[PDB]
Write a protein that binds this ligand. Structure first.
Ligand SMILES: CC(=O)N[C@H]1[C@@H](OP(=O)(O)OP(=O)(O)OC[C@H]2O[C@@H](n3ccc(=O)[nH]c3=O)[C@H](O)[C@@H]2O)O[C@H](CO)[C@@H](O)[C@@H]1O
Ligand SMILES: CC(=O)N[C@H]1[C@@H](OP(=O)(O)OP(=O)(O)OC[C@H]2O[C@@H](n3ccc(=O)[nH]c3=O)[C@H](O)[C@@H]2O)O[C@H](CO)[C@@H](O)[C@@H]1O
Ligand SMILES: CC(=O)N[C@H]1[C@@H](OP(=O)(O)OP(=O)(O)OC[C@H]2O[C@@H](n3ccc(=O)[nH]c3=O)[C@H](O)[C@@H]2O)O[C@H](CO)[C@@H](O)[C@@H]1O
Ligand SMILES: [Co+2]
Ligand SMILES: [Mg+2]
Ligand SMILES: [Mg+2]
Ligand SMILES: [Mg+2]
Lengths: 462, 462, 462
């Protein structure tokens, strides 16, 4: 029986942002959504988020996350950020006065924390019957973290903040994860003896360690070897660091499952993208949102995709694209732009310097050069000539061949098997199997250059 | 007198691939082709590759590599993958029963191994008169490697596999390279006493170390400090790692020879690309295949080239290109696509949003904007107007100036010094020094917008 | 009272370059300009640069840097590169014979050295009253550096060059920064006893350490913990290394000030670029020269900008651009090319496959597709149709709407609120609120395909 509190009420000063810290993203999810997903998995009885300026967030919690995760998540308010000890107090008010379960406390700013780390904490805390168990790690650069102070016997004495004591002695490398389990009555008790006479002048949660030690209670510290699972984010340097470690691990999972990623350091893959066996991802690539790739694909160099579905055996090279689908064996790129609502059928082709927006394109159809296709629908085994524009719902049949430089002034229907001359402005329906034209005839004006440009190419018309 | 065996018969389970492991590529060559190139250099008397599912490969060996390397390479078959000890046995059947030379054994999955490492092995093995010499290295992460066990006196006792013994004690960091020299009779002998009662239930080559130790033979282990030269690839994580270390070294060689590479971490250069003094390679660049760059070039950001020859003093910026040539002082990019058979002469120019396919383009000719050129040939000091298309063999002369938006419906010949109006559809030959036109005349319809769009721009026609 | 000498007279052999080593760039400035900027800040009384082949440089010093830094910088000549000790001698000739200040000596090839490191050196040198103080650091890879040799008591004895002594014993990891302070008379004195009997056969500055030790003078060595501030560049491998460390630090400064940089390892930012709070820089991006970004911008993936000003809240995605301005809330990209003299007004739009050169574009104007705009000026809330070309000063009014595939043959004036049909060649002024057209009428030729292509699309016109 446990209640979990997420502390998300701080000002996030060092982010230098008008966006609340806990809303800052990595791998496709805000830090708060990473944290709330880990806990939901653990499925505790009670789950509580402590908010300050409550409206720019209260909305995303529950409103997007408790429904999605299919559980209740309570919001508790802390009006002024008096400290992590004061934040816990406010979290406790959402529990009944007679609450008897355990209390787990975590920060909204530790995004790699996972269910398992949380479940072992709870299990250690029960196993040793502790008043407080705290997760610790060891780090080469310990700055900003509260340091674990141990007695002569390796007993946890206290936690000391960066700003406070450990004067010169900050050299300590065993750090506080900011992740705890507590007996409730020992928690209510220690919090009532908190004072704010310290370098930050705040009610620190960390002080509770030394206070329960004084009442000869049991304090257990529990070392997490994989430091990244408990790393904090207080600034944008630490954010990009952890984003990058999370990326390495998501890439590694895909590799081990049968995906060749040529260059992991420049391959960004959101948590949620799926990618099938034997596809190849070339450097300089981001796969974002709910993107899905089948097997045997080539994801070429310099491709950005957000919510794009790509079937088996398709090629997607230097493409910028979102909210679109690309069929089996289709070819896309290089230098191609897909806007939302693009659907390209199996074995379809979108070539170099082509943009498609809100359009349907049938199996084995080809748009290879320098063309814009918007709000149009196109059948199968058709061919759209180079340097053309769908001007905006235009309907094009199957096995159509349109000429280079045709303009389609919406709405127009071009029948199956129809053709269009090069340089045609199409303004009316074209029956099946007709040829549509508008360009006037070629007229050659002899010796024009000798007369009108008497230098350069004037030799050699000579 | 030595015979070299390459073991390439395993199932490659952890690659999760329908492509045989040994065919997986890095820096432009399969692991098997890296390995076979190193040995060819050493030039042993006999060279033997052990294959299993023999047809998807037997083809590339000899068929591409023994001819290319100009030596004989024998294939020996091992039908079922009973173990690296069973693989060696099958390799031995390609040697005469009375064979008396030394036997070198290596894996098809150690691609950075070089002639020199191999030559020192053979020399140590002769020098110390050993029954077996084995190459070892030391590693921070030793997982998957067989561990070297040494007596109290640093004598090699045995090799132990990851799956087997070293229970907790796997902490050992001295690893087996999988690269050996053997006396033949001691090799035939130890292999005949191999059993498969082990965690994998296989006939391990590694066991031969302990067996010859038991017959008080000489076992020499030889430490390779540069660990990368003997690193194995069992999965796609290890593949991308080693691909990346090989890349760093190929980049470093080019830098030391007089090439500025702005960002090595994002510059991929195949082994085989040549690059001349004082050129500059900007970030996000891959130079692949048999690509060649002269001196004083700029290789701009985000350029991909496969089998592209670029002369001195040329510029190639954000270009995607293959099987093509670019003359001295030519400018290409940004946002340019070259398809096979593109030849651009000295001081030529292909600009932004231009594609060229199977075309010849003469010295000092310019195609700067938004145009497609396919299966066409073009003389010197000509100028192809923006937003044009060569529709498919078209022939264009020297000092031609064609108008913006001209369509060339193949086959058509445009004489030297000829011009074309803007918006011309060219369907017939254009004599030298003629002007070709087809666009009809401008007609202005006054106050059209007041009448037909009574809002917006209707003020201010006001 | 100090005089500072920069030694820049060497041949730079290992750069394998026809460009003098000291002119090689990182983060937007030559190594010499990094070095001269650090010293200028310190503001010494005298500042002297030692040059050899004097003309390819003497020009940039003073000529660009002493004016810019608003101080005098003297050039002293050393005709042949006899050594760093001989270089100092030549530097001294630019001081009066009776000069009595201190003498600071540094290399033109240590580009991260900063004013502060220099000011603490001078202060240590005064504080301890030393004859020579030398800056040292400690390094994992010590190759090419002169090693600090200390007595049994940690007293600096001598400096030994890589090429010379420390035979096997080169294992020493405490290195010479090449940055010194000297008493002038002790400097004149030690230099007069220099000989060139050594592995390089040169007059080494380093020998002066041992010589003043012999005259029982005071030799102080001063350890710099941040090794990068005193790292040298003798080859292009070391150059790209230090360029990359300088980049990491410039990125970090921007992050800590309120800029999200998704991927630091692939974000190049010149020293001098300014970037405002809450903007987001996506991977694969270079911001170069005097580029300026406001707040709330998105700098999308694969953007290169050199001297580009971007206001607040603008979007710049996969754009290659230079010497141009982009207004507040404007959208640019993806796949856009800006050439010098491009000015786009607030809330303007340049879309995919658009190039703009030397053009003015007013507030809320839109050029979204496949168009070239050169030497043209365009008012506000206008719309330039897809696949169009400004052919070269063309003037376009406000609230104009031009049709897809319009060619504007410069010089032409299009009045406010005017329209243009699709496929129009505009050769004469268009009054305000007129419609301009030239395309002829659509003609449909029935059953053409059955007759002229009797296969394929011939079914199904069937
Ligand atoms: C005093 C304290 O607990 N310090 C811990 C905190 O340091 P650190 O310096 O972060 O303390 P933070 O300011 O980020 O606060 C911790 C978390 O508590 C929330 N918050 C903060 C203040 C407030 O009044 N109300 C509130 O709800 C914040 O939103 C944040 O998510 O986490 C570190 C690990 O990352 C630990 O090593 C520190 O020991
Ligand atoms: C038992 C054995 O030798 N283990 C060694 C092997 O480990 P490792 O676990 O790789 O053994 P692998 O499965 O990759 O096999 C080694 C090589 O032998 C070939 N092969 C394998 C099985 C088979 O029945 N037939 C066959 O020809 C494979 O194709 C491969 O190229 O290489 C490592 C270094 O990389 C060493 O540290 C291990 O000590
Ligand atoms: C003998 C000497 O001083 N060696 C030092 C030099 O090594 P290092 O091997 O560089 O000596 P370099 O050849 O780069 O010379 C040092 C600097 O002096 C200038 N120069 C050189 C030769 C010459 O005749 N005239 C001249 O003006 C060069 O342009 C360069 O900027 O710097 C290192 C740190 O980077 C130190 O660890 C070495 O102890
Ligand atoms: Co690009
Ligand atoms: Mg924090
Ligand atoms: Mg292996
Ligand atoms: Mg140097």
């Amino acid at each position: 029986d446990t209640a979990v509190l997420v502390l998300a009420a701080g000002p996030g000063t060092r982010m230098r942002s008008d966006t609340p810290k806990v809303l800052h993203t990595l791998a496709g999810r805000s830090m708060l959504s990473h944290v709330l997903h880990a806990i939901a998995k653990l499925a505790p009885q009670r789950l509580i988020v402590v908010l300050g300026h409550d409206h720019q967030r209260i909305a995303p919690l529950v409103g997007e996350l408790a429904d999605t995760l299919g559980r209740t998540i309570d919001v508790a308010l802390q009006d002024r950020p008096l400290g992590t000890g004061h934040a816990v107090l406010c979290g406790l008010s959402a529990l009944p006065d007679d609450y008897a379960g355990n209390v787990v406390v975590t920060s909204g700013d530790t995004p790699l924390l996972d269910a398992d780390t949380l479940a072992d904490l709870i299990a250690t805390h029960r196993a040793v019957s502790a008043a407080v168990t705290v997760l610790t790690t060891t780090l080469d650069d310990p700055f900003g973290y509260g340091r674990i102070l141990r007695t002569q016997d390796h007993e946890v004495m206290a936690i000391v903040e960066q700003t406070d004591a450990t004067p010169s002695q900050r050299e300590i490398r065993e750090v506080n994860a900011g992740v705890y389990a507590f007996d409730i009555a020992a928690l209510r008790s220690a919090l009532s003896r908190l004072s704010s006479n310290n370098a930050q002048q705040e009610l620190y949660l960390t002080d509770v360690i030394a206070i329960l030690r004084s009442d000869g209670q049991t304090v257990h510290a529990s070392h997490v070897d994989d430091s990244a699972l408990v790393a904090g984010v207080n600034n944008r340097v630490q954010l990009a660091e952890l984003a990058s470690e999370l990326n390495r691990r998501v890439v590694a999972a895909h590799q081990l499952a049968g995906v060749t990623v040529v260059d992991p350091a420049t391959t960004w893959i959101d948590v949620d993208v799926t990618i099938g066996r034997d596809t190849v991802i070339h450097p300089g690539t981001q796969l974002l949102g709910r993107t899905q790739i089948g097997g045997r694909c080539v994801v070429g160099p310099d491709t950005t995709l957000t919510d794009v579905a790509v079937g088996d055996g398709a090629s997607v090279v230097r493409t910028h694209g979102s909210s679109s689908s690309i069929g089996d064996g289709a070819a896309v790129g290089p230098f191609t732009y897909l806007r939302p609502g693009t659907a390209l059928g199996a074995d379809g082709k979108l070539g170099a310097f082509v943009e498609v927006k809100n359009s349907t394109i049938g199996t084995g159809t080809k748009v290879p050069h320098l063309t814009y296709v918007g709000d149009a629908d196109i059948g199968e085994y058709s061919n759209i000539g180079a340097s053309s524009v769908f001007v905006n719902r235009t309907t094009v049949g199957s096995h159509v061949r349109t000429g280079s430089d045709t303009m389609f002034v919406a709405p127009v229907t071009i029948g199956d098997g129809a053709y269009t001359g090069a340089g045609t402005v199409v303004r009316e329906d074209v029956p099946p199997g007709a040829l549509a034209v508008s360009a006037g005839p070629q007229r050659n004006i002899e010796n024009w250059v000798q007369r009108k440009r008497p230098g350069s190419p004037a030799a050699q018309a000579s």
